[PDB]
């Protein structure tokens, strides 16, 4: 009877049908576009010889002339557009070639003239210029992220405002935690992040709507947007010679200011020869305080709040605020205010509206019926919709400025908070910005701050796109992820706390902060993370104001050692070891940092270990899908049981916790790295005995890993101890009998090899074997996948079936974070392996994987790979090659680390270890580095081909003096030092 055909089961594509029908008749070129003309997929209509893949037929069908002309042929007849000479022809399946009329030819040429830049382009500074009339390659492609600046104030990690702005100005604005200033929309589409009325405005002339900022109509002749670092600029040109500019950014915090403030400046210039009397209506929607009640009870959200008006000391209306009855929703107060600067005179809105139904009327949001006549009625219910209207006359050649301040004041930064505090802070903010030039000065301050922040490491390679992407975009993303973790984004709209392992972000940004005089901020972050470690050694999984989920995951506390090692090595500041930080257990208890690190190592190395001595897997580790044990316990219950066992067995503290739980090998690698880091810290702190115990413990752990985790072709991922019959003993190598692919003998994890190399456990032969294995199995045309297919139901029957189609997330996708860690391991191995061929192959693999994650390269084939040309995405779909969000992940952090490492810079106790690994085709690499008391200018020259310090003669000069030691000293003479490296044939 009725049959069903799915999207993935439809094998034939329109382009394939077009190639079949017209391949031997016309030259299809390298790229072409096509569309099915009917629901039976029998006939196609397309255009040939495109410069790149693009939805050209979708744009063509929107043209009335072209669609009307095509109606003579389609459906029931396949046609193709072909350009010959300077004219366009239509070709049918019978070989007939017909010259199109003049209007059709003109429309076709105008459409296909600029296909190469349909998705935009990047300037020399890495800013993305977007045409507002073009289709979006993906939901994250045209997204910009804005952040505040709470440096030097309390609770910087928890109180920094955040915002997401798209190409049209749409998006949302959030204060501390998940508090909303502008409304966030939770709907079916990924493109709808906020309420559609946010940040939009209307322009009226003579009572007729002449402009809407979120709708490009026939009266707009030019409309472009520019995404830059922490600011967005949108430009419009109208047919009546009006030039409109919108600049959106976030105000850096000053004393007496509200906690969150977003500034939008609208400049309207009259390029005509006649004065024009216009009016502006700026609209928006406040975010509700009862987010759960949106899904629970919308009427509750509506009836608990009302609208209120704000007046200055002269009694003039200035803006609207939402007023809440319940006390819990009175701890934050929102506001929106408008100032109209006409030449030297200042004015304030003359009308307002607070009801969506009255404002829209019988029209739509794009053409509201009551937009030009605001009723000045204060709504007694929610939601907090607002529309402020003001008239103004602009003279020929003159400009009128409109400054809108949206924001929120909170009790999180004030004592005895009330609405009076909000009024005082709003008065301070308005007095600060009473002059026109103050907004420009603040914008310049933001730009200069980010430019100076990015100065720690500067690339100079001639490739402007790469230099801009690293020096500006990547540095900003690292700062943003340091301040925000993974809590906000275009599609990250729920409430999320800061994860412990997200300390990984501080692995990259700290060197930047220390280089702008904010070493104390890095110390504060380190102590804040240390405060979430319990006395035994486990840590809270998440924390925003307080910690939660104690010891839920077994790998969390082991990441802190890497951050402490990085900070102490870079700064040589061991005094942080003596700092007394509160313990996560509580009850006014404090411990020295050194003792906390010792407790972490002891917990992961002696107490929470399995039969083979490797750390217990517990519920899971870094890999969230490794739910091998269904009877796992957290830190608190494990501690209680451990104390019970100690009292029963009459043992001593530090003994093994008896159990039959599984062991994590990646946890063992992390523990070994942490032990080595603590040994280095102790020997830097003149703690000889502690260094000795750390060294012997590291040797013992390495012996255990080599004895019990190496399975003759790979390092295992999990060791299983609960099957006494021997049915299953390990997972993550050959012979584990858990592979779900008949053609693959065993399961293989990328992280196993990555952290075997990173922890300096694997040997050269093991490195070569694992590299061969990952080349055979884990390498895909779109990168390196996290893991080969596995059948975990045999050992854990409680695991459910899959949730994703092939190529998505857990079903064979390429996760860029894990791939970046693997690339770091490959670089580290290639820097020191004896075999030159193995090093060359590993460097080639690393560069191949790096080329797939650089955001700017997303603009080469934007409509196939999607992603974002300035911000890193999460993973790559192995079925289509498309980059899919969210935009916040460890990809940016580990990519920055990998690029710096490939430049050859490493930090050790003796100073700067230099060991660059350049591309085979590269012949020159120049960059500049900053140190707290010096600067370095590195230049490297080499011939075409692979070259490295390990197996190639070279000349190294520091300050013009030839040197043999590759460790550059960390100078403190406040002088610039020139370093030159030359590779010979």
Residues of span 181-220 touching a copy of itself by CB under 8 A:
183, 185-191, 195, 207, 215-216
Residues 131 to 150 in contact with a copy of itself, rule: CB under 8 A: 133, 135-136
* Least CB distance to a copy of itself at residue 13 (A): 10
CA dist 677 and 558 (Å) reads 11
Nearest-approach distance from CB 287 to Cl ion, in angstroms: 18
Q: Say if residue 511 is exposed, middle or buried (CB neighbours under 10 Å; 0-12, 13-18, 19+).
A: buried
Residues 110 and 852: their CA atoms lie apart, in Å, by 33
Question: Would you count residue 68 as binding a copy of itself (CB under 8 A)?
Answer: yes
- Which of 30, 96, 364, 637 is the binder for a copy of itself (CB under 8 A)? 364
The one segment of 107-115, 372-380, 738-746, 748-756 that binds a copy of itself by CB under 8 A: 372-380
- If one counts every other C-beta atom within 10 angstroms of the C-beta of residue 46, the result is 27
Residue 361 binding target from Cl ion, a copy of itself, none, CB below 5 to 8 Å by type: a copy of itself
Q: What residues make contact with Cl ion under the rule CB under 5 A?
A: 489-492, 623, 749, 751, 885-887
Burial bucket for residue 751 (CB in 10 Å: 0-12, 13-18, 19+): buried
Part in contact with a copy of itself (CB under 8 A); list of ranges 362-370, 451-459, 688-696, 961-969: 362-370
**3-class secondary structure, 226:** strand
Q: Of the two residues 489 and 746, which places its CB atom closer to Cl ion in the complex? A: 489
Q: Identify whether the C-beta of residue 241 lies closer than 8 Å to the C-beta of residue 271.
A: yes
Which of these, 41, 234, 19, 17, lies nearest to 144 by C-alpha position?
A: 234
Q: Which of 264, 262, 222 is nearest to 242 (CA)?
A: 222
- Cβ distance to a copy of itself smaller for residue 388 or 774: 388
Q: Which of Cl ion, a copy of itself, none does residue 623 bind to, with CB < 5 to 8 Å depending on kind?
A: Cl ion
Q: Give 164 or 768: the residue with its C-beta nearer to Cl ion.
A: 164
**Minimum distance of a copy of itself from residue 5's CB (angstroms):** 5
Least distance CB 861 / a copy of itself (angstroms)? 18
Beta strands in 93-142 (DSSP E): 97-99, 121-122, 128-131
Please choose which of Cl ion, a copy of itself, none residue 751 contacts, taking the beta carbon within 5 to 8 angstroms, the exact cut-off set by kind: Cl ion
Contacts of a copy of itself in 864-893 (CB under 8 A): 880, 884-886
Both tokens of residue 935?
A: 């600067």
Q: Which is nearer to a copy of itself, 271 or 369 (CB)?
A: 369
Beta strand pairing status for 305-311 and 399-410? Answer: unpaired
Nearest approach, Cβ of 801 to a copy of itself (angstroms)?
5
State which of residues 17, 18, 32, 35 lies at the interface with a copy of itself (CB under 8 A): 35
Q: What is the gyration radius of the CA atoms in the chain, in angstroms? A: 31
887 binds, among Cl ion, a copy of itself, none (CB under 5 to 8 A by kind): Cl ion
The binder of 688, among a copy of itself, Cl ion, none, by C-beta within 5 to 8 A per type, is none
Q: Which long-range contacts (CB under 8 A, 24 or more apart) does 469-474 make?
A: 469/122, 469/126, 469/854, 469/855, 469/856, 469/870, 470/896, 470/899, 471/126, 472/125, 472/126, 472/229, 473/126, 473/229, 473/855, 473/856, 473/870, 473/871, 474/892, 474/895, 474/896, 474/899
Nearer to a copy of itself, 298 or 690 (CB): 298
Q: In a 10 Å sphere around its CB, with 0-12 CB exposed, 13-18 middle and 19+ buried, how is residue 39 labelled?
A: exposed
The option from Cl ion, a copy of itself, none interacting with 654 (CB < 5 to 8 A, set by class) reads none
| From candidates 160, 270, 281, 307, binder to a copy of itself by CB under 8 A | 307
Size of the site for a copy of itself (CB under 8 A): 118
Say which entry of Cl ion, a copy of itself, none residue 734 contacts (CB below 5 to 8 A, set by partner kind): none
Closer to a copy of itself by Cβ: residue 41 or 449? 41
Sequential DSSP letters for 311-370: E-TTS-EEEEEEEESSGGGSSEEEEEEEEEEETTEEE--SEEE--HHHHHTTS-SSS-TT
The span of 456-464, 488-496, 518-526, 617-625 binding a copy of itself (CB under 8 A) equals 488-496
Q: Which does 310 bind (CB under 5 to 8 A by kind): Cl ion, a copy of itself, none?
A: a copy of itself
**CA of 245: how far to CAs of 277, 369, 761, in Å?**
18, 25, 58
Residue 5 touching a copy of itself (CB under 8 A): yes
Kind and range of the H or E run holding 635: helix 635-649
Site for a copy of itself in 75-94 (CB under 8 A): 75
Closest CB to a copy of itself among 75 and 582? 75
93 binds, among Cl ion, a copy of itself, none (CB under 5 to 8 A by kind): none
Q: Distance between CA atoms of 786 and 772, rounded to whole angstroms?
A: 16
The residue within the footprint of a copy of itself, chosen from 15, 129, 378, 690 (CB under 8 A), is 378
Q: Residue length, the chain?
A: 985
Interface pattern 537-576 for a copy of itself (x via CB under 8 A): ----------------------------------------
Closest residue to Cl ion in the complex (CB): 489
Q: Name which position in 102, 218, 327, 974 contacts a copy of itself (CB under 8 A).
A: 327
Report phi then psi at 585, rounded to 5. -65, -40
**Which of 87, 254, 377, 640: binder of a copy of itself (CB under 8 A)?**
377
**Read out DSSP for 448-459?**
HHHHHHGGGEEE
The listed partner (Cl ion, a copy of itself, none) that binds 61, CB under 5 to 8 Å by sort, is a copy of itself
Closest residue by Cα to residue 582 from 574, 590, 593: 590
Q: Which is nearer to a copy of itself, 315 or 726 (CB)?
A: 315
Q: Interacting stretch for a copy of itself, rule CB under 8 A, among 368-376, 583-591, 611-619, 677-685?
A: 368-376
Touching a copy of itself, residues 751-810 (CB under 8 A) = 800-805, 808-809
Nearer Cβ to a copy of itself (286/570): 286
Q: Nearest distance from residue 17's CB to a copy of itself, in Å? A: 12
Residues whose CB is less than 8 angstroms from the CB of residue 644 and which lie 6 or more positions away in sequence, other chains included: none
To a copy of itself, the closest distance from the beta carbon of 793 in angstroms equals 13
Kindly state whether residue 295 participates in binding a copy of itself, applying the rule CB under 8 A: yes
The maximal CA–CA distance of the chain, rounded, in angstroms, is: 97
Burial class for 942, CB neighbours closer than 10 Å (0-12, 13-18, 19+): buried
What whole-number distance in Å separates Cα of residue 193 and Cα of residue 144? 12
Shortest distance, CB of residue 301 to a copy of itself, whole angstroms? 7
Nearest approach, Cβ of residue 427 and a copy of itself (Å): 4
Q: Which residues pair with 551 in a beta bridge?
A: none
Quick one: which of 40, 85, 124, 742 contacts a copy of itself (CB under 8 A)? 40
Please pick, from the candidates 99, 114, 222, 296, the single residue that binds a copy of itself as defined by CB under 8 A.
296
The sheet with strand 967-968 has its strands ordered as 905-908, 911-914, 967-968
**742: CB partners within 8 A, 6+ apart:** none
- 96 phi and psi angles, rounded to 5 deg: -70, 135
Instruction: Tell the smallest beta-carbon distance from residue 357 to a copy of itself (Å).
Output: 7
Q: For 381, left (φ over 0), alpha (ψ -120 to 50), or beta?
A: beta
Cβ atoms of 897 and 824 within 8 Å: the answer is: yes
What is the SS3 string spanning 857-912? HHHCCHHHHECCCCCCCCEECCCCCCEECCCCCHHHHHHHHHHHHHCCEEEECCEE
Q: Using the rule CB under 8 A, which residue among 170, 493, 785, 870 binds a copy of itself?
A: 493
Binding site partner of 723, from Cl ion, a copy of itself, none, Cβ cut-off 5-8 A by kind: none
Options 123, 376, 461, 630; binder of a copy of itself; rule CB under 8 A: 376
Sign of CA dihedral 711, 554, 526, 751: positive
Least distance between Cl ion and beta carbon 778 (Å)? 12
- Taking CB under 8 A as the criterion, the residue among 8, 274, 652, 724 binding a copy of itself is 8
């Amino acid at each position: 009877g009725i049959t069903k055909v799915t999207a993935r089961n439809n094998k034939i594509t329109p382009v394939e049908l077009l190639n079949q029908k017209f391949g031997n008749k016309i030259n299809l070129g390298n790229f072409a576009d096509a569309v099915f003309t009917d629901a039976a997929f029998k006939n196609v209509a397309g255009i040939a010889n495109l410069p790149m893949k693009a939805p050209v037929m979708q744009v063509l069908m929107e043209n009335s002339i072209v669609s009307k002309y095509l109606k003579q042929f389609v459906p029931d007849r396949s046609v193709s557009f072909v350009e010959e000479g300077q004219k366009f022809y239509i070709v049918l399946e019978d070989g007939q070639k017909i010259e199109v009329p003049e209007d059709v030819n003109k429309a076709l040429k105008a459409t296909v003239s600029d296909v190469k830049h349909w998705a935009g382009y990047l300037t020399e500074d890495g800013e993305h210029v977007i045409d507002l009339l073009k289709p979006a390659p993906g939901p994250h492609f045209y997204v910009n992220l804005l952040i505040g600046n709470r440096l030097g104030f309390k609770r910087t990690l928890q109180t920094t405002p955040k915002s997401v702005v798209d190409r049209f100005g749409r998006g949302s604005f959030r204060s501390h935690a998940a508090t909303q200033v502008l409304a966030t929309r939770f709907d079916m589409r990924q493109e709808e992040n906020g309420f559609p009325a946010n940040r939009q405005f209307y322009l009226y002339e003579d009572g007729k709507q002449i402009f809407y900022s979120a709708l490009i109509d026939d009266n707009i002749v030019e409309a472009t947007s520019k995404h830059s670092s922490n600011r967005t600029v949108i430009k419009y040109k109208t047919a009546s010679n009006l030039e409109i500019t919108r600049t959106i950014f976030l105000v850096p915090h000053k004393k007496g200011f509200p906690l969150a403030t977003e500034l939008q400046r609208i400049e309207i210039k009259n390029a005509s020869d006649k004065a024009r009397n216009l009016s502006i209506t700026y609209t928006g929607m406040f975010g509700t305080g009862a987010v759960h009640a949106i899904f629970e009870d919308v009427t509750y959200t509506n009836v608990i709040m009302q609208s209120a008006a704000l007046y200055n000391d002269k009694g003039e209306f200035i803006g609207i605020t939402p007023d809440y009855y319940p006390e819990e929703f009175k701890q934050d107060t929102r506001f929106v205010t408008m100032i109209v600067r006409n030449g030297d005179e200042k004015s304030f809105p003359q009308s307002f509206s607070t009801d969506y139904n009255d404002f829209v009327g019988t029209g739509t949001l794009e053409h509201p019926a009551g937009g030009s006549n605001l009723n000045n009625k204060l709504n007694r219910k929610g939601p907090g919709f607002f529309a402020l209207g003001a008239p103004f006359t602009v003279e020929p050649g003159k400009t009128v400025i409109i400054d809108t301040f949206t924001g929120l004041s909170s009790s999180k930064d004030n004592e005895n908070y009330s609405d009076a505090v909000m009024l005082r802070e709003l008065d301070n903010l308005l007095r600060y910005f009473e002059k026109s030039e103050s907004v420009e000065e603040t914008l310049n301050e933001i730009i200069n701050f980010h430019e100076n922040y990015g100065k720690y490491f500067q690339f100079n390679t001639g490739n402007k796109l790469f230099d801009s992407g690293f020096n500006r975009n990547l540095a900003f993303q690292v700062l943003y992820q340091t301040f925000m973790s993974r809590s906000f984004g275009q599609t990250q709209k729920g409430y999320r706390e800061i994860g412990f392992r997200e300390i990984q972000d501080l692995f990259a940004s700290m060197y930047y902060f220390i280089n702008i005089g904010y070493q104390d901020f890095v110390k504060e972050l380190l102590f804040e993370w240390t405060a979430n470690v319990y006395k035994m050694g486990y840590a809270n999984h998440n924390f925003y104001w307080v910690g939660k989920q104690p010891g839920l995951y077994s790998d969390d506390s082991l990441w802190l050692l890497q951050a402490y090692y990085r900070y102490i090595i870079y700064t040589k500041d061991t005094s942080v070891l003596n700092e007394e930080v509160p313990v996560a257990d509580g009850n006014n208890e404090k411990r020295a940092v050194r003792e906390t690190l010792k407790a972490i190592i002891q917990y992961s190395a002696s107490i929470s270990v399995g039969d083979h001595g490797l750390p217990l897997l517990d519920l899971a580790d870094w890999n969230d899908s490794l739910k091998i044990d269904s009877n796992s316990i957290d830190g608190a219950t494990k501690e209680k049981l451990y104390y019970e066992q100690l009292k029963k067995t009459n043992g001593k503290y530090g003994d093994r916790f008896m159990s039959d739980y599984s062991e994590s090998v990646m946890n063992a690698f992390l523990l070994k790295l942490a032990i080595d880091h603590l040994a280095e810290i102790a020997t830097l702190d003149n703690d000889t005995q502690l260094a000795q115990q750390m060294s012997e413990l590291s040797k013992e752990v390495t012996d255990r890993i080599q004895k019990h985790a190496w399975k003759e072709n790979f390092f295992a991922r999990v060791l299983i101890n609960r099957y006494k019959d021997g049915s299953y003993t390990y997972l993550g190598a050959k012979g584990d009998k858990l592979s779900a692919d008949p053609n693959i003998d065993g399961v293989y994890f990328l992280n196993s090899f990555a952290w075997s190399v990173l922890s300096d456990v694997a040997t050269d032969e093991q490195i070569a074997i694992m590299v061969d294995v990952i080349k055979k199995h884990l390498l895909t045309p779109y990168g390196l996948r996290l893991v080969t297919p596995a059948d975990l139901n045999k050992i854990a029957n409680d695991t459910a079936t899959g949730h994703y189609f092939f190529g998505d997330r857990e079903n064979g996708a390429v996760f860029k974070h894990a791939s970046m860690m693997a690339v770091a391991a490959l670089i580290k191995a290639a820097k020191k392996v004896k075999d030159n061929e193995l090093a060359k192959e590993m460097a080639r693999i690393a560069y191949f994987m790096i080329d797939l994650v650089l955001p700017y390269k997303n603009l080469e084939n934007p409509f196939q790979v999607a992603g974002n040309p300035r911000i890193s995405t999460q993973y790559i779909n192995t079925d289509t090659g498309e980059n899919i969000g969210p935009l916040l992940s460890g990809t940016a952090t580990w990519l920055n680390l990998n690029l710096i490492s490939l430049a050859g810079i490493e930090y050790t106790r003796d100073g700067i270890s230099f060991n660059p690994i350049l591309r085979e085709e590269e012949t020159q690499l120049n960059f500049t580095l900053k140190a707290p008391k010096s600067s370095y200018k590195f230049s490297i020259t080499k011939p075409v081909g692979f070259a490295r310090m390990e197996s190639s003669e070279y000349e190294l000069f520091v300050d013009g003096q030839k040197i043999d030691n590759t460790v550059i000293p960390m100078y403190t003479d406040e002088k610039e030092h020139i370093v030159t490296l030359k590779f010979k044939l």
